[PDB]
């Protein structure tokens, strides 16, 4: 054979740093693209139950292979595609329709993961989860539950993008780039989302002592709009384009980064809330949390003004009336 | 105000960006090309524009609240040329694109018409850019967007066989074991049905592999390597008829080729350009050649050394572009 | 000739994103590195005043272009070299010994300064002044007297490296990546330096708030040795290996990526703040500014405490006294 | 404390991707600096016998955290800080000398790697070994020798660097980038290195077909001279700055990348040419290896003319004559 003509074998394959994506809609192909533009993988693995659909999105991306540093790119509707994944993300599931809620899709999607989790885990026990599919707190607690890893291990992708949206607006209104403009959006990854106002700075300069009505409807400069264009972003988007893809693709490869790379960066995202600000029962939402390896090791508690500790709680009952009459 | 409570302005500044790409057509391919250049940090300012008012704010809103994770602090769009003023670089990925079993050259003339009104809107606002064709036929595109432009030669390029090529390179790699990068082979001639793989300068580490098997890519060839240049032909027709499209390939093949103009890195790739007094060629034929690119666009040509039949393959490429190309209305 | 057997020359120019870097000591040749990873500029142009470390230098780095995306590396003693820059380093000048302060070797630096400033801004009308050399605030005062540019093209690399080593040490006592810690060292890149403790926070979560002691003497935990240990840093490095070059050399291509990238981030950067904090003079000392690509466009008025204004009024009328004895 | 009133501990240590260098000098520094700026490593461990200098190396590294993606950068004397590597660089011994053969440091590194290699393999047994001291194709053999570990784990840093001139040489001539220039450089990584004329190609154009005296005395051109520039090169840098750093330091983070990525890209690099090229001693020089997360998997068979030929087997000669008598 011309390959032994040319190559003479010396030795007798295990990656070291695989990422699975599940679910090759728009979500699950801008994840994976991001996640092969930022260097995070030796192998990316993609899973879907359309077979046709999954070949050519596997194809397309193997044709990119040379101008690429992710050696093998694999996919298969069999779970075994996806063995010994560092990471598996998933994007499966229903997605919402102009004017439907994401905490509408919870029905179809805890059944859907009911089927992927277990598959999941029997194939990569060493994996970290990263929920992507929504409502991805109630998710997030969902793919825990069935899983059987510990919490620190399963991670939803939460507010890390109401956050980036929240601090791309913040940088337009004050002509500064995104990354010095500081910002948290909490809560649910929805219309409950909480604007930490008291926490919204440049340079360490508290915008709220600056302007204390901010955030607020006697705000002169109406910045709670700015929370609205947050909320109302992936309604916006999909009136537009029909769906969103691109902002959630990069925040997904942004969390994939913390993890892959274990830099203990803080980012708002879905993990068990029960002894914080009261909240008793086994609710999920985005909190600030320190992110690597282990998944999220640790909690940061954000001191919070009386509205914004109240707003936080009402999210975390809007999550739980949903929550509770859940059966899986 | 609270801007101004916060901080005092200096000066008012010009605002010119001096790395601005613009990415015309904000379908699969013209997102597909948007991403890799945001991702790979190669502007400063990148404009979008389409006809669908709706599908174009969209996509611009989709992309600008990714920003946090970006370098490219300024991303706009409009369906009016004037937010493209004073692109490096303005990619065109605009009009019909092919069905499923469709020729590339079947989308000819609606892509001239609609070349007809982009191209002047274009070049009223950039007049110094570099024009990359990324529409297909990609090849006559290229001599359209030429002609149509008034622009020399060099700042006119096609997207040619730099993806042709790529797909070659991959699917060497799969068969050998060897990333794509150590695998070396050039797909010439049109970006379709008739390219030419020349199997005379396809090699590992500088060994040819038609000198360890003489009949490589010939019929008489026991491991059949001509079907690695099949695939590469069918390739996109085989993803089209799977996912309804192509996308991140292309894309990809697109962002390299801007990373080579935008940096003036002067590598070499198999894109769209004038052959006329190569390979016996009379005509202002425009197909994939061996190209340095960079900062003035096509500053040289590559004389890669055919062996007869290549340069049978190559002229036959170029007469079927040729046939098409001279009969043009515009 | 092989080369026109082999090429077809179809066109007959001038750089778009040049830097040059002035002095090729070790802090030169750290920045020189970290541009040339960092993908920022299509040129390089080094200058110094030995003729074969300088040629030296360059052929090492030209060694290194397979692996590089720099095409154009180039070296003279003579600034015609430096034409077309859109950025130009100053590195150059004696450096602070063991116990010596970095404002002993104004009069050495300034006559260097004498010299290469006016040979700089003659072959490059865009440039972007940025001053290394030490004592930074005042050498950055001292290049915009001589140059004659305005105030946003002079910028002193100043405490950009400061607040870094203070982010780091920091992260190190909170078990958190430096980028999630936020706090700012303003003043002299000295020993007048300033912790703005009102300002330091993770994810908006102010740490005075949970401690107001901190930073003072009364402070259990002693967060007043973290700026104590931002002083002594260049000094403990001088100690150890005899020089610095690394974290300077980082901080340096950081605020390079900034202009390059017209980003508009901000940093902790030697400019004029005459007219802030009661300061009546032409003082240059580090406040965040916003950086971009007609360099400090912008500046942030840091809401300081009545003992943090006092500190950075010291370090003003430090850098001030040493102002009144310069001579031009 | 501070630290658990901000932030709520929920986990309680293991690098994935750890790489080592042994050696701080010039050499081993701009194989860290590189390899940081490359985001390579979750871990960075330093290992010299100059506890100073090494602690120096290690905090300036450090200080710059803020602007990497590598969270750990560690160092000792110690080779228990070098513990789980997935790469262990050495760079330690006596450097090339001004006007000195690489050869004349051979003994004394010998002596030296008596003691690194035992330590690295104590801490780290399944790591793969780089050696990029010199003369590296005999220490690579003595590191395979002293470790026990098989040959695919033990490379030498080789001609990687050798082709990267001629790459860089061939370009400046031609008005094309070195990655559009190819050409390989085999043999001792040296004075009896070997132009591989017969591969030297643009756009899979063989230069040789349009030169036929390509690289010989009778080349009108006389492209030898290219050959003879990458000979001198160290000589010349040397002479200049009194050592080589910046172009070995890319070079061996490429094929840091290639191992860590597992990217089985072709490097020309120090590997046993026992059975090739009628070569029946243990002999080690570059030839073009395939090389992955297991080191040297495969090796290319070049077809070498026969003059390229006995100038590979001269080059193995004069290795063999060195390393016959070395006693270890
Ligand atoms: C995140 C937004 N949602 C999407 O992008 N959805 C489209 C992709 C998708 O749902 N694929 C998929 C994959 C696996 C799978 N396993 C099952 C038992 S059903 C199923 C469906
Ligand atoms: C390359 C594959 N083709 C596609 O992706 N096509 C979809 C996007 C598209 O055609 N946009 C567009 C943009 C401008 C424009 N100006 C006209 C007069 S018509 C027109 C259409
Ligand atoms: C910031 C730490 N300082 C250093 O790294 N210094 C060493 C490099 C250096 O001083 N170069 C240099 C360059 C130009 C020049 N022009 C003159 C009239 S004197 C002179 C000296
Ligand atoms: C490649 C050029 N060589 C250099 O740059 N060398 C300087 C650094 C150096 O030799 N370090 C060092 C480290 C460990 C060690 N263990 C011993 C028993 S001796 C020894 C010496």
Redesign the pocket.
């Known amino acids: 054979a011309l390959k032994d003509q040319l190559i003479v074998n010396l030795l007798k394959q295990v990656p070291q740093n695989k990422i699975t994506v599940?679910?090759?809609?728009?979500?699950?192909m801008a994840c994976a693209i991001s996640i092969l533009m930022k260097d995070l993988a030796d192998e990316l693995a993609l899973?879907?139950?359309?077979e046709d659909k999954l070949k050519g999105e596997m194809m397309d991306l193997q044709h990119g292979s040379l101008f690429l540093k992710t050696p093998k790119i694999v996919s298969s509707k069999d779970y075994s595609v996806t063995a010994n994944s560092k990471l598996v993300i998933i994007?499966?599931?229903?997605?919402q329709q102009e004017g439907e809620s994401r905490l509408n899709l919870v029905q179809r999607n805890v059944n859907?993961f009911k089927?992927?989790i277990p598959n999941v885990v029997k194939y990569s026990p060493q994996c970290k989860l990263l929920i992507?599919?929504?409502p991805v707190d109630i998710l997030t607690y969902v793919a825990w539950k069935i899983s059987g890893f510990p919490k620190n291990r399963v991670i939803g992708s939460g507010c890390n993008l109401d956050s980036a949206r929240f601090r791309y607006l913040m940088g337009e209104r004050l002509g500064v780039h995104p990354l010095s403009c500081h910002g948290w959006v909490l809560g649910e990854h929805g219309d409950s989302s909480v604007p930490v106002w008291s926490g919204v700075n440049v340079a360490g300069v508290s915008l709220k002592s600056l302007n204390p009505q901010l955030g607020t409807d006697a705000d002169k400069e109406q910045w709670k709009d700015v929370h609205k264009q947050v909320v109302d972003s992936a309604y916006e988007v999909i009136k537009l384009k029909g769906?969103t893809s691109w902002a959630?693709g990069l925040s997904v490869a942004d969390l994939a980064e913390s993890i892959m790379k274990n830099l203990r960066r803080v980012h708002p995202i879905s993990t068990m809330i029960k002894g914080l600000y009261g909240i008793k029962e086994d609710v999920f939402l985005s909190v600030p949390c320190i992110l690597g390896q282990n998944g999220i090791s640790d909690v940061v508690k954000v001191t919070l003004t009386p509205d914004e500790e109240a707003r936080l709680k009402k999210s975390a009952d809007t999550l739980w009336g949903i929550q509770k009459e859940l059966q899986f």
Chains 1, 3, 4 share one sequence.
Do not use: L, W
């Open positions: 599940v679910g090759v809609g728009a979500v699950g899973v879907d139950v359309i994007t499966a599931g229903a997605r859907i089927f992927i992507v599919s929504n769906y959630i």
